[PDB]
């Protein structure tokens, strides 16, 4: 049998498979699609996702296949500028296609020793008090201690548990397409900016290889929710919302996505977990579905690997739902506000003009970017320092950065004075003694995902918060 079986070869399951392999966990990735989909969904990581890869040393391969972008207009298309005093060392946006993002995460999980069986489709599942039984379409049963559901928005695992999926349905659908056009490239650059003053969800971005990525609003709601949109439909929407069809060339692939904002009610149902789109779906327009799914698995990874090793605290796995469900609600809630600001009605247009006056303030622009990039996410840990909950930025230490010592996914203890020590938790927590100037506190205790659970200078105060997140001593 296996220790953990994840259901989904997407960027969420691959990120969870790598986090579990850092602790020697026999994992198994079940993916329905044999060949990975060539549909370029997302187009890059945000600041927090960039920091997540840096904590594992995966940032080099991402930066080799992409390029950094520091512009304005990521919040509801409000074309501004990038903030100045952004509390993060990776204050930029890496532009990598999701196909490359899934490719690097799959190669890293395979390099760490993860069974990725492509072509296996989960049909049914059931669980006892000792493990979970998985029934595949081919008829092969698989026993596992814990199973996590990363099988996308139409999650089969979620339906096999009764976990409700409440939220608002799809009301405003949009058309996306990677293509070229008979119109000049320089001519479209001057046309999009003029129409964007009213219809904000009309865009066009180049890919360098001669093709572009044009997103055009659609009319009505499609009843199939999976039917291939015709090319004549694409030009009819381009001529109605932009005044010119551009005469498109060869289209690589077309799609039509909705704006249904739904979120799972339970993230854990006793040995079965949900992550990524399996636990929350929201519109791609103002979306963090790739950033959220990565950070969801980045939160569950070290926690689930702590249970199979036997040192996890009592209700550690219960905190996955208690910490990643509110993050999905506020994200999903922000996506609705961003589409609302993109509405063409005279009401929402007046609110967008008010927001445009407020984003001129740097603190307002910084607050929105810190919330969108998810670098301001703060969990509930307890009472104490002002750092309790938030992650720790890449602090420049005396010898190298800070994220260069967290590759093994172990507990970190930044000790600037050296008088603090770990007694009995050496098997889970390291002891980095490096003086930093960006840190105004004597010592910080970091969870494997970077979030702070203790900050101070007392040894006895350290002895209080150590077993709360790392179990008892040896
Ligand atoms: C057009 C578009 C643009 C987007 N743009 C962005 C963006 O700019 N930024 C951003 O952050 N997010 C963006 N997103 C959202 C983000 O891409 C998704 O949320 C993300 O792909 C979901 O990650 P996941 O691995 O959890 O889901 P998936 O990638 O859907 O993973 C599910 C995988 O498991 C497989 N599977 C399904 N059911 C089963 C089963 N029963 N058994 C086995 N395997 C199964 C599926 O075939 C699939 O391969 C966009 C989404 C879309 C559609
Ligand atoms: Cl605007
Ligand atoms: Cl760097
Ligand atoms: Cl102003």
From Swiss-Prot:
UniProt binding sites for FAD: 12, 31-32, 98, 122, 156, 277, 290-291
Binding site for rifampicin: 196, 213
One Gene Ontology MF term: FAD binding
Cofactor: FAD
EC number(s) recorded for this UniProt protein: 1.14.13.211
Keywords from the named record: FAD, Flavoprotein, Monooxygenase, Nucleotide-binding, Oxidoreductase
Role this protein plays: Monooxygenase that can modify rifampicin, thereby inactivating its antibiotic activity. Inactivates a broad range of rifamycin antibiotics.
Protein name: Rifampicin monooxygenase
Organism: Streptomyces venezuelae (strain ATCC 10712 / CBS 650.69 / DSM 40230 / JCM 4526 / NBRC 13096 / PD 04745)
């Amino acid at each position: 049998m296996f220790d953990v079986i994840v259901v989904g070869g997407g960027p969420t399951g691959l990120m969870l498979a790598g986090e579990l392999r850092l602790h020697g966990v026999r994992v198994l990735v079940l993916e329905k699609e044999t060949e990975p989909t060539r549909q370029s969904r997302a187009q890059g990581l945000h600041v927090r996702s960039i920091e997540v890869m840096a904590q594992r040393g995966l940032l080099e391969r991402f930066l080799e296949r992409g390029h950094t972008v520091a512009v304005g207009g990521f919040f509801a298309g409000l074309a501004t500028s990038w903030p100045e005093r952004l509390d993060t060392a990776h204050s930029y946006v890496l532009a990598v296609p999701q196909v490359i993002t899934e490719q690097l995460l799959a190669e890293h999980a395979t390099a760490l020793g993860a069974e990725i069986r492509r072509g296996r489709a989960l049909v049914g599942l059931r669980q006892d008090e000792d493990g979970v039984t998985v029934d595949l379409a081919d008829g092969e049963q698989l026993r596992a201690r814990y199973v996590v559901g990363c099988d996308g928005g139409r999650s089969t695992v979620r339906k096999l548990l009764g976990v409700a999926f409440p939220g608002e349905p799809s009301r405003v659908e949009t058309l996306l397409g990677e293509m070229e056009m008979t119109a000049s490239q320089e001519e479209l650059t001057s046309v999009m900016t003029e129409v964007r003053k009213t219809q904000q969800r009309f865009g066009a971005m180049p890919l360098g290889d001669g093709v572009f990525r044009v997103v055009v609003p659609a009319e009505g709601v499609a009843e199939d929710r999976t039917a291939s949109p015709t090319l004549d439909e694409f030009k009819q929407q381009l001529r109605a919302h932009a005044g010119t069809d551009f005469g498109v060339h060869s289209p690589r692939w077309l799609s039509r996505f909705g704006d249904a904002t739904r979120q799972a009610e339970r993230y854990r149902v006793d040995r079965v977990f949900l992550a990524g789109d399996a636990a929350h779906i929201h519109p791609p327009t103002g979306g963090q579905g790739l950033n959220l799914g990565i950070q969801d698995a980045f939160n569950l990874g070290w926690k689930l690997a702590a249970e199979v090793d036997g040192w996890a605290p009592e209700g550690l796995l219960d905190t996955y739902h208690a910490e990643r469900h509110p993050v999905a609600t506020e994200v999903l809630d922000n996506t609705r506000a961003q589409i609302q600001l993109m509405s063409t009605e005279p009401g929402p247009q007046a609110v967008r003009r008010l927001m445009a006056e407020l984003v001129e303030f740097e603190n307002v622009n910084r607050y929105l970017i810190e919330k969108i990039t998810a670098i301001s996410v703060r969990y509930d840990v307890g009472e104490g320092h002002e750092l309790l909950g938030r992650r720790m930025r890449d602090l420049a230490l005396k010898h190298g950065r800070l994220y260069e010592r967290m590759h093994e996914g172990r507990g970190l203890l930044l000790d600037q004075t050296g008088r603090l020590s770990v007694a009995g938790w050496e098997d889970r927590v390291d002891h980095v003694v490096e003086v930093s100037e960006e840190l105004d506190v004597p010592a910080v205790l970091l969870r494997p995902d970077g979030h702070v659970v203790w900050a101070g200078e007392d040894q006895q105060e350290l002895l209080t918060r150590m077993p709360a997140w790392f179990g008892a001593a040896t």
